[PDB]
Design a protein around this ligand. Structure first.
Ligand code: MG
Ligand code: MG
Ligand code: MG
Ligand code: MG
Ligand code: MG
Ligand code: MG
Ligand code: MG
Ligand code: MG
Ligand code: MG
Ligand code: MG
Ligand code: ZN
Lengths: 59, 51, 37, 115, 62
RNA sequence: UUAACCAUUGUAGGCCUAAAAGCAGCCACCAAUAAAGAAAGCGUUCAAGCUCAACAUAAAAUCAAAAUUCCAUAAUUUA
RNA sequence: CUCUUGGAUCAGGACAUCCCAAUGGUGUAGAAGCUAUUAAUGGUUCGUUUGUUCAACGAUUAAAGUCCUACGUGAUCUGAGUUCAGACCGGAGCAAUCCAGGUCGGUUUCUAUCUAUUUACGAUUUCUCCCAGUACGAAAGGACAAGAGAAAUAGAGCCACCUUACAAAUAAGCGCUCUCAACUUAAUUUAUGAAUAAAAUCUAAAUAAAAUAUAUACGUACACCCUCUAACCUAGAGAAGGUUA
């Protein structure tokens, strides 16, 4: 049911996710709602990734 | 998807894998294969010549 | 739509509204009086 | 292919072009997005310490098949309003000028021979 | 049947319109007489102004 | 301290101001009426005209929490 | 009282926007203009010094934007100056010499060890015609939007022709061909409607719509599992890759 998660407050419209392709002009910033539309699993996965220890065993 | 081949070629200098694949279809080998995106209504049986 | 630090009513007919996250003073009689914050 | 500083021949009966001068006329500007001028293009000419508008009617560079290639770069002087400076032309003029986008009727009237 | 452009608006005295099989030139009396367009087309190769023009040859600059 | 309803008159008060009439001034600033300032504003060449306050009728109730590419992840209640 | 910058080449980025785009107000009739909001999409020319204390002039353009990046950039290149060894004038010093004064001439080399990097995409602008000499306006004058055609630059390819070479079967441009879709928005403008007794209100109330530049929801391209003595090749530095009565 990762599609049915809920956000408190106005986080849907205020939380931005950032990524860079690596080429000039490759910086993209997207809001939480937009990312949830494209991928129904990305939000939950990103939260878990951040909380794990930053080492090789994380992957 | 459908795969199409053309331009019959010699059989002598080819790997066995390719020769086995063509023997099943009962045709001599072709130089090149490519893929085409086709809808269900437009599907055509394998082995049919095109013009 | 002059954007000003302080928005002030300029005539009796001027009225105030809260649209799309900002404060507006709108007067129909005098479109000159329209302002945004 | 007329460019800045190209030397051109005035094929016209106007006194300004006809009178001999120690310097031949030279192009100063081409009224195109590109700098290259072909048949049917206006240019800015420097004549006898003066500037005048002019029109290209022939050149030595090859074109598409079935069109005439001349031996010299020929030009006609044009007034600011667009009326021809001269009153007669004797050298043959191409017939492609009739349909090309632009104002060529006035020059066509004065020209006798079309090749 | 194609559309037809109007030419000579820049000029204040001479206007010409080119139809498919007809050509019409309008101008003031002073402009008409100077260019004398009737003479040329009537007398195709015998025009007086054309005869005045000549040819050029020279062995050396002298 | 307010949101509802309204407006008659002595006379257009003098004053070189044509006229400056509640309103340019300029001094006075009084009158009737339940209730009406020789008027708190607009606006008229001056006048007209629009308002305010009055007439009854209602109701509510001070400061403070810029130039390479965003940058831990997240979270409102268990003594 | 004094005393490092230009150019070439290739550009990365900001928005405090010059042009192209969507809008509000006007002392906005039309056409021109003046001012403000939103947006970084790609673009943003060619020549020249008689006078001008960090200026000017000619011809054009839809426009010839303002800035940051140890002058962005000299182990990629180059011109002044910092600045000397020679030599002259002008002003000083008895002289040797001197000057934040004039001028002419005048020497920096690099074989790349490490990081980093070297194989697709779905376009911008201008002009003519048409609407129409219409709308508007007393006249003078003079447009929207919608439709059509031409170009120019940018990108990707190609050789029937033309042109230039090898006085070779090929390579090139000065020759020829092809270039498109928007799920997801901002300034703004409408519709229904409470707080607030309405005939109120576009709504950081619950709702329904339209509307820049962007972009990747959506497509194209790619997909194969691979014999090899050797020879040949429109494939190539090597290796790899393709072809074999
Ligand atoms: Mg750049
Ligand atoms: Mg801005
Ligand atoms: Mg360097
Ligand atoms: Mg020397
Ligand atoms: Mg020197
Ligand atoms: Mg020197
Ligand atoms: Mg290396
Ligand atoms: Mg139109
Ligand atoms: Mg209601
Ligand atoms: Mg309403
Ligand atoms: Zn107002």
């Amino acid at each position: 049911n990762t599609r049915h998660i809920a956000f408190s407050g106005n986080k849907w419209e205020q939380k931005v996710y950032s990524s860079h392709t690596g080429y000039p002009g490759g910086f993209r910033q997207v809001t939480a709602a937009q990312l949830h539309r494209k991928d129904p699993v990305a939000i939950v996965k990103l939260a878990i990734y951040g909380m794990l220890p930053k080492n090789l065993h994380r992957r | 998807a459908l795969t199409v081949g053309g331009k019959t070629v010699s059989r002598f200098y080819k790997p066995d894998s390719r020769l086995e694949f063509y023997r099943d279809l009962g045709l001599p080998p072709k130089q090149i294969h490519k893929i085409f995106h086709v809808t269900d209504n437009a599907v055509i049986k394998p082995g049919t010549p095109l013009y | 739509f002059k954007t000003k630090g302080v928005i002030k009513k300029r005539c009796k007919d001027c009225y105030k509204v809260k649209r799309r996250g900002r404060w507006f003073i709108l007067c129909k009689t005098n479109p000159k009086h329209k302002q945004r914050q | 292919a007329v460019q800045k500083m190209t030397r051109v021949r005035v094929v016209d009966n106007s006194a300004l072009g006809s009178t001999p001068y120690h310097r031949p006329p030279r192009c100063i500007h081409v009224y195109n997005k590109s700098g290259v001028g072909k048949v049917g293009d206006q240019i800015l000419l420097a004549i006898r310490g003066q500037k005048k508008k002019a029109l290209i009617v022939g050149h030595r560079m090859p074109g598409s098949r079935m069109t005439p290639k001349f031996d010299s770069n020929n030009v006609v002087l044009i007034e600011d309003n667009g009326n021809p400076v001269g009153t007669r032309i004797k050298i043959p003029i191409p017939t492609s000028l009739r349909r090309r986008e632009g104002e060529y009727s006035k020059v066509l009237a004065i020209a006798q021979n079309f090749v | 049947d194609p559309y037809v452009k109007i030419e000579g608006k820049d000029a204040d005295d001479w206007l010409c319109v080119d139809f498919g099989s007809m050509v019409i030139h309008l101008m003031l009396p002073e402009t008409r007489e100077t260019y004398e367009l009737e003479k040329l087309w009537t007398l195709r190769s015998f025009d007086d102004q054309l005869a005045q023009i000549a040819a050029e040859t020279l062995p050396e600059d002298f």
